[PDB]
Amino acid sequence: DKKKADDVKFAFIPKLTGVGFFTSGGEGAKEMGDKLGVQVKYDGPSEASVSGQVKYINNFINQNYDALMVSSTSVDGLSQSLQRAKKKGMTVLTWDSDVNPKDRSFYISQGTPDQLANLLIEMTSKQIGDKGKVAFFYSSPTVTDQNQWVTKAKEIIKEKYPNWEIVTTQYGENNAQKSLSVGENILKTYPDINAVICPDATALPAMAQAAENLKMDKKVVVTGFSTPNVMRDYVKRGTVQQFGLWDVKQQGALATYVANEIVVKGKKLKVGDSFEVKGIGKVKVEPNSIQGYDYEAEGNGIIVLPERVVFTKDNIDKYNF
C-alpha cells in the first residue's frame, strides 16, 4: 500500500448542504470512510454558488487533505482551484455533477445523459401520452449535470415527441422558497400545462407542493429527480405517481471507496478497468466520451452506478435516503 489509513483524510463536497440528496450522499461517503478506517469530512456552502464551493475547496487544500470529491455547481468555475489541488498531489474526484474532465480524475456518475434523459421522458410519456404542453424546471442554466441531461432530453423530445411543446424552462436555484414560487408561477401562467419535468432535488418537491397548494395535484403530471425521504408523502397522496433517482448513499460510498483505492492502496485505475464493491456491485471505468466529452487521458474516466431507481407507491418504502 501507498499509505496508512489513519494518516489520510478525504473531503466530500456537495453543491450545497441542507438538501436531502446531499446529506444522504455525505452519509454514504462517511459510512464508507468509517468502514475503511479513513477520515471523511462532509462540508460545503449552505447556498449553491461557485464562489462558495471555491472557498471550501481552498480550505481543504490548505488543510492538506489527501483527496477531494466534489459535486460541482459549474463546468469550469472550479478549474483553477482543482488544478491547484492536483499540483499539490491531491486526488480529485467528482460525483453527481462533473467538472471539465481534465480537472478531475474520475467522475462517479449516476448515469449517462442518455440514461437519465430517457428516464425523465419515459416517466412523463407514460402519464401524458404523445401530445401535450410540458415545462422543464430545475436548478440553474449553468450547472454541469442537469444541463447535460436536459440538453439530451430536449433533443429526444424534438424527434420522438413532435406533438409535445416545451413551453418554458424555469430555474429554482437550489432554494426551496424560490423553487416553490417558480413552481406556482408555472401553474398560474400556463394553467393548461400537462407536465412539469423536474430533474433537481429541490425543484421536484417544490413543484409537487405548488400543485397541491393550487389544487392542481392529479391534474398536472409532476415528475423528475429527488430523494425518496423528501418525496414519500407526495407519492402516497398521488400528487407524484413516479419519479427517479439512484442510491445516492451508495454513490457517496463509491466515491470514498475509489479515493481509498487510489490514495491508500496506490492503485493506478485506467479506462477499461473494473471492480466490485460490496453493497454496490460491479462497476467499471469508462471513457469520458460516454458523457459527450472530447477528452481522454490515462487514469481519467467515468464510473457509472449499475442501476438507477424509479420510485412508485409500490417501492417508495424500500429506500431510506
Ligand X SMILES: C[C@@]1(O)OC[C@H](O)C1(O)O
Question: What is the contact surface with ligand X in residues (CB under 6 A)?
Answer: 15, 21, 71, 96-97, 145-146, 199-201, 225
Residue 222 contact among ligand X, Cl ion, none, beta carbon within 5 to 8 Å by kind: Cl ion
Distance CA 151, CA 164 (A): 16
Is 75 an interacting residue with respect to Cl ion (CB under 5 A)? no
Q: Nearest distance from residue 139's CB to Cl ion, in Å? A: 20
Residue 199 contact among ligand X, Cl ion, none, beta carbon within 5 to 8 Å by kind: ligand X
222, 263, 271, 280: which one contacts Cl ion (CB under 5 A)? Answer: 222
Nearest to 303 by CA among 266, 243, 265, 259: 259
Give DSSP secondary structure letters for 216-232.
Answer: -BTTBEEEEB--HHHHH
Is 221 an interacting residue with respect to Cl ion (CB under 5 A)? yes
- Residue at 174: amino acid letter: N
What does each C-alpha distance from 12 to 24, 49, 114, 247, 282 come to in angstroms? 12, 16, 27, 16, 23
Q: Nearest distance from residue 201's CB to ligand X, in Å? A: 4
Q: Nearest distance from residue 216's CB to Cl ion, in Å? A: 10
Stretch that binds Cl ion, among 50-58, 153-161, 237-245, 263-271 (CB under 5 A): 237-245
For residues 53 and 260, which CB has a smaller minimum distance to ligand X in the complex?
53
**Residue whose grid cell is 498531489:** 89
For residues 99 and 222, which CB has a smaller minimum distance to Cl ion in the complex?
222
For residues 196 and 305, which CB has a smaller minimum distance to Cl ion in the complex?
196
Residue 221 contact among ligand X, Cl ion, none, beta carbon within 5 to 8 Å by kind: Cl ion
For residues 8 and 252, which CB has a smaller minimum distance to ligand X in the complex?
252
Q: Nearest distance from residue 146's CB to ligand X, in Å? A: 5
The three grid cell numbers given for residue 178, joined into one nine-digit string: 424560490
Stretch that binds Cl ion, among 51-59, 71-79, 128-136, 219-227 (CB under 5 A): 219-227
Distance CA 217, CA 241 (A): 11
Distance CA 308, CA 251 (A): 11
Give residues with Cβ within 8 angstroms of 14, minimum separation 6.
22, 25, 26, 42, 44, 71, 96
Distance CA 97, CA 300 (A): 16
Give residues with Cβ within 8 angstroms of 87, minimum separation 6.
none
Which residues in 119-239 belong to E strands, given as ranges? 132-138, 164-171, 195-198, 221-224
Residue 147 contact among ligand X, Cl ion, none, beta carbon within 5 to 8 Å by kind: none
Q: Nearest distance from residue 222's CB to Cl ion, in Å? A: 4
Q: Nearest distance from residue 120's CB to Cl ion, in Å? A: 13
Count of residues making up the chain: 321
Q: Nearest distance from residue 124's CB to Cl ion, in Å? A: 9
List interacting residues with Cl ion (CB under 5 A): 221-222, 240-241
